[PDB]
């Protein structure tokens, strides 16, 4: 018998709710939206409101809200958005201690009810939180993935598209490294209809676009005043969920476990990835200049510093 | 030159923001999201977050947030979601009069910059607020429309689909009048696969579905705590916008100005409508039973009552 | 590991190819397009032409053209469009017996390589050809299905839409039995925005729409000069395939095996069905008037009559 | 009032019909399918068939078949697929006859041309129309990049979504691909596929149209060409400002003028908003020079 895919979204706040609604609209599977017992009723309210949209938008989906992880049993994909979010002036690194505990508590319940699932993590700081989920899970590395690069290249592409007055569809970006201020946007691997951006955009304006990408999460935090971005992070999660569920073998930046690639091991890092029905099918190694190699090395040091703060 | 449709959404809260994001993903036009000066930055945050999703979801649309109505100039369609969140223990009169003042202020600036726009109104109470928008615009009646019935039919279809374990695609509801006590459903014009629902669902369970539809807004409030539905309301506005922008000539329940239809004149009422490129193309006049006529007379009496609260 | 659905389409003519292309652009699965050994190369050309559209239209799907049923192994769904048109100087008896022979040979190869698949049959006459697939497969009845009523309701809806100048989305048709004189339309369960059509269209013009639906296949045959309709038949097959692959539990008219429904057994007949992940989830039994029962009894004699033409 | 876009497709053969069905499914506007008086009824049949699918696929569009150009009045876009040395001279006369009726009923329309050889036929459509260069476009590069992307995706076992190609000039020997400006997820293909396999993919791309012809035995490709037309139509109707290869009128770009050539383009609401000029190596300028010579050769066969 033909059975729907099942996606559990852990954390039913801004990012989780926005993710859930996109997953159901795209009919990518049944959705279980999970929060803490104190936010059970709000979570069910969000889930029923989304389901009540299904006849207008013309989609078939089950959406439920729960505080009971038994409702996540046999999920194909579990998306983790559970944790504390930042306010203006905070680094993503300021959340490590609270979020690590949430990741350990969440992973333990997820692997109990869905021992065969793929896990995609948003929770900040995401390199260190995806690492925590990996180790707690006991899963092989292909099955635990972080989102950062899709969102960072998305922001990059938006600003480039505004600069050149072209469709975002024909702009390509390339971000490696941690999801931090030390991100390594590779302008050399960045194009407008395949044309190197360095040939199209003067260095000063291109440098400003690279800096605006680095500070992109902060820009949304400062505008909102009382939370962080959710539309583009949710979109970024859905693209990664869709690559796996439909076995698309996309080349996408994702937070992956390294065992030698770029000359690093035992860390999660933002790298180029093949993403398919088996999760991360492989980490792609670019040939880097010594300047890019150095920029990446600073990124890895930030990651390891954050990992030293884990219990 | 071919130019995009332009949609302004007035009020950048949960419903306005959710509507803007759906409109952009469907590439129905460029979106201008408007709120009060005090929320200029949050509104610009939401709009820029949505645009940053565009390279990932693969849509071409411009989204800006603003507090300057000059940014709304030459909108084809304006959606009004502006209104105050009812104060704990505020009188219905003070609500009507506070929201009436907002519709008057909003409508003045909208018609100044967009003299040819179609306006769709969500603001509660939608009958009296659409009436307020109509009289202040001095637009013809075909161009000033309220949302109500589409949201009630959506909830009705969800509940019927749950009862019968079938797709929402193959359920239809039929509602005249507004929300709650003011709703006039025709179960006799309500079907699963074109089969009367009275032949498929026992009377006690069908009456319970009709009641649950009446109370359906309050059901989401009670689950959320401090808030009201936005996913299904947003979907409802988008279906009505889409019907006009693509000249689809849908049959949809809408809040329309009457001039003799059903016996009534000088009022806005939830009635079946052909909705297309000239907005309300006509009000459809059913033959109603004596019971139905008297349920509608009582609904119209509730509508006259709210109109007497206006200044 | 997540794996794409696999759909084999048997017969790479107008309907089969049109069907394969729609299935691919919807990313419903990988498509295997099968024809006779003599048409191997044109079938590969069609498949590769479709595949070369994938980067432009933006779908991830494999499409291959073959004469080797080994390529159909582990198909979730098989769509049988294989068949021969009535050649000038051929009896109807010979036409039926030729198509029966094709159904026997195709089914034997299909079930050898896909013992767990659902089968959807287009080949006319669909009632007798579906029965042949059913008897040959050894499959339970829920897994062997014919297309007929979806295509008839589609033409009916198109004609009503034109008559009323409204969206086809808001029109519904209801038909039991087959095409032509075998069609049993229930205009009383056919609506525009849930309004019975008998109230909106005078009887003469409405009877003319019913008769044009009966003749609908013939109208396209007579307009083309060579061959029969393929766009609407392909779309009808795609709606039924999607209902099963996505477990939609649609209510759709289907050619279903009866074991007592409507007072008939051991035949395939056009009936309302719930269509989902287990295939036909049930046949829906309506209360019919004496007029409707008499009309459906003539349709049943026509089915039994073609079954008597089978070897 | 809000009113649908109107698209006329001239030639209701395999490519015209396939284009029309895609345009209506995507709700890009009303479709008018046009052919010769002798095929009026088959044309109405295909159009009615496509319309009868609309309730099932859930799209709202009008689709009509005709041999009367009066029905194409006020078309926002007109796609020309009508056609069949002597090849040039016959198809040229089809273009002049078509353009004359098209500009008569739709003087303000954008025109996209498929008819082979599309360089000369787009030139003929341009001169006859008297339209500015921005309103008369040929399809070629999108089709060639689609085949290339398909071959590369197969070679690397990855999504066609993350493969890009870059072709100047026309089909076959006339095709000037820039493998250096072709990538998988932004990675240069020269670092992913060895030269022998990449050369074979470039050669398959050149022969790609011939490969479908040989496999079919009784016509040429229609699915990928129709998709190539729809993407260019969509860039214009929805003012997307896509960068796409297109057959465009040159007034100095790449050092050439008074010809149509396959060049990178910004495609939006005003049709071709600009011809993009990039720095070519000396090998690529030489190849483009050879390609342009071949376009001048076919342009001399025109009456
Ligand atoms: N142990 C837990 N189990 C389940 N849900 C939890 C748990 N702890 C917290 N949550 C829930 O996680 C949700 C987080 O949502 P928001 O506070 O709205 O934050 P959001 O914007 O979604 O960001 C979530 C996360 O992703 C990053 O972008 C951000 O920095 C943060 O780490 C809240 O609803 C909260 O109750
Ligand atoms: N004069 C005004 N101009 C513009 N925006 C305004 C104005 N007055 C209020 N607003 C804005 O309207 C928005 C209303 O959003 P929410 O309070 O979040 O309510 P929402 O869920 O969006 O529902 C919109 C409206 O529809 C009805 O359900 C109800 O009447 C509600 O106010 C707020 O962001 C508020 O700042
Ligand atoms: N044994 C077989 N196995 C596989 N394919 C076969 C076989 N016998 C014939 N076919 C193929 O079936 C295809 C039928 O295509 P068309 O003749 O173009 O007919 P189409 O418009 O697709 O209609 C398909 C069929 O369904 C009904 O409408 C009608 O009964 C018609 O035969 C042809 O390509 C034919 O070679
Ligand atoms: N003057 C004309 N006006 C309109 N239509 C015409 C005219 N002359 C011919 N046609 C029609 O053009 C159609 C061409 O369709 P096909 O022969 O099937 O060719 P197709 O596969 O659609 O390719 C169309 C064209 O594009 C190029 O690939 C190549 O030049 C080919 O001729 C036919 O229906 C033919 O009757
Ligand atoms: O910055 C944040 O806090 C959330 C996030 O990860 C992002 O938006 O980049």
PDB file of C-alpha atoms and ligand atoms in Angstrom, chain C residues 10-16 34-36 39 69 81-85 99 102 105-106 122-124 228-230, ligand 3:
ATOM      1  CA  UNK C  10       2.405   0.639 -21.237  1.00  0.00           C
ATOM      2  CA  UNK C  11       1.808   1.993 -24.763  1.00  0.00           C
ATOM      3  CA  UNK C  12       3.887   5.014 -25.932  1.00  0.00           C
ATOM      4  CA  UNK C  13       1.187   6.474 -28.253  1.00  0.00           C
ATOM      5  CA  UNK C  14      -0.487   9.901 -27.862  1.00  0.00           C
ATOM      6  CA  UNK C  15      -2.231   9.044 -24.512  1.00  0.00           C
ATOM      7  CA  UNK C  16       0.732   7.060 -22.994  1.00  0.00           C
ATOM      8  CA  UNK C  34       6.987   0.755 -22.775  1.00  0.00           C
ATOM      9  CA  UNK C  35       5.906  -0.102 -26.331  1.00  0.00           C
ATOM     10  CA  UNK C  36       6.323  -3.091 -28.743  1.00  0.00           C
ATOM     11  CA  UNK C  39       8.663   0.890 -31.804  1.00  0.00           C
ATOM     12  CA  UNK C  69       9.452  -5.380 -19.306  1.00  0.00           C
ATOM     13  CA  UNK C  81      -2.828   2.438 -22.651  1.00  0.00           C
ATOM     14  CA  UNK C  82      -1.678  -0.394 -25.033  1.00  0.00           C
ATOM     15  CA  UNK C  83      -4.276  -1.143 -27.729  1.00  0.00           C
ATOM     16  CA  UNK C  84      -5.388  -1.004 -31.377  1.00  0.00           C
ATOM     17  CA  UNK C  85      -8.005   1.362 -32.948  1.00  0.00           C
ATOM     18  CA  UNK C  99      -7.403  -5.797 -27.384  1.00  0.00           C
ATOM     19  CA  UNK C 102      -3.020  -7.462 -25.810  1.00  0.00           C
ATOM     20  CA  UNK C 105       0.094 -10.551 -22.881  1.00  0.00           C
ATOM     21  CA  UNK C 106       0.810  -7.097 -21.273  1.00  0.00           C
ATOM     22  CA  UNK C 122      -7.468   3.025 -20.357  1.00  0.00           C
ATOM     23  CA  UNK C 123      -7.790   0.440 -23.207  1.00  0.00           C
ATOM     24  CA  UNK C 124     -11.353   0.459 -24.696  1.00  0.00           C
ATOM     25  CA  UNK C 228      -8.701   9.974 -30.803  1.00  0.00           C
ATOM     26  CA  UNK C 229      -8.327  12.427 -27.843  1.00  0.00           C
ATOM     27  CA  UNK C 230      -5.180  12.190 -25.618  1.00  0.00           C
TER      28      UNK C 230
HETATM   29  N1  LIG E   3       1.272  -5.566 -26.774  1.00  0.00           N
HETATM   30  C1  LIG E   3       1.541  -4.271 -26.631  1.00  0.00           C
HETATM   31  N2  LIG E   3       2.380  -3.876 -25.643  1.00  0.00           N
HETATM   32  C2  LIG E   3       2.677  -2.578 -25.529  1.00  0.00           C
HETATM   33  N3  LIG E   3       2.241  -1.553 -26.255  1.00  0.00           N
HETATM   34  C3  LIG E   3       1.405  -1.974 -27.220  1.00  0.00           C
HETATM   35  C4  LIG E   3       1.020  -3.271 -27.469  1.00  0.00           C
HETATM   36  N4  LIG E   3       0.156  -3.311 -28.551  1.00  0.00           N
HETATM   37  C5  LIG E   3       0.049  -2.071 -28.954  1.00  0.00           C
HETATM   38  N5  LIG E   3       0.758  -1.207 -28.156  1.00  0.00           N
HETATM   39  C6  LIG E   3       0.899   0.211 -28.334  1.00  0.00           C
HETATM   40  O1  LIG E   3      -0.193   0.899 -27.780  1.00  0.00           O
HETATM   41  C7  LIG E   3      -0.114   2.250 -28.305  1.00  0.00           C
HETATM   42  C8  LIG E   3      -1.489   2.844 -28.458  1.00  0.00           C
HETATM   43  O2  LIG E   3      -1.313   4.208 -28.919  1.00  0.00           O
HETATM   44  P1  LIG E   3      -2.306   4.919 -29.973  1.00  0.00           P
HETATM   45  O3  LIG E   3      -2.695   3.949 -31.047  1.00  0.00           O
HETATM   46  O4  LIG E   3      -1.713   6.245 -30.346  1.00  0.00           O
HETATM   47  O5  LIG E   3      -3.637   5.188 -29.112  1.00  0.00           O
HETATM   48  P2  LIG E   3      -3.924   6.202 -27.899  1.00  0.00           P
HETATM   49  O6  LIG E   3      -4.460   7.510 -28.396  1.00  0.00           O
HETATM   50  O7  LIG E   3      -2.718   6.202 -27.013  1.00  0.00           O
HETATM   51  O8  LIG E   3      -5.090   5.398 -27.150  1.00  0.00           O
HETATM   52  C9  LIG E   3      -4.651   4.205 -26.444  1.00  0.00           C
HETATM   53  C10 LIG E   3      -5.775   3.200 -26.366  1.00  0.00           C
HETATM   54  O9  LIG E   3      -6.691   3.634 -25.330  1.00  0.00           O
HETATM   55  C11 LIG E   3      -7.984   3.890 -25.886  1.00  0.00           C
HETATM   56  O10 LIG E   3      -8.154   5.250 -26.115  1.00  0.00           O
HETATM   57  C12 LIG E   3      -8.037   3.005 -27.139  1.00  0.00           C
HETATM   58  O11 LIG E   3      -8.495   1.699 -26.855  1.00  0.00           O
HETATM   59  C13 LIG E   3      -6.596   2.994 -27.654  1.00  0.00           C
HETATM   60  O12 LIG E   3      -6.203   1.784 -28.294  1.00  0.00           O
HETATM   61  C14 LIG E   3       0.681   2.146 -29.616  1.00  0.00           C
HETATM   62  O13 LIG E   3       1.872   2.904 -29.503  1.00  0.00           O
HETATM   63  C15 LIG E   3       0.892   0.639 -29.794  1.00  0.00           C
HETATM   64  O14 LIG E   3       2.099   0.309 -30.441  1.00  0.00           O
END
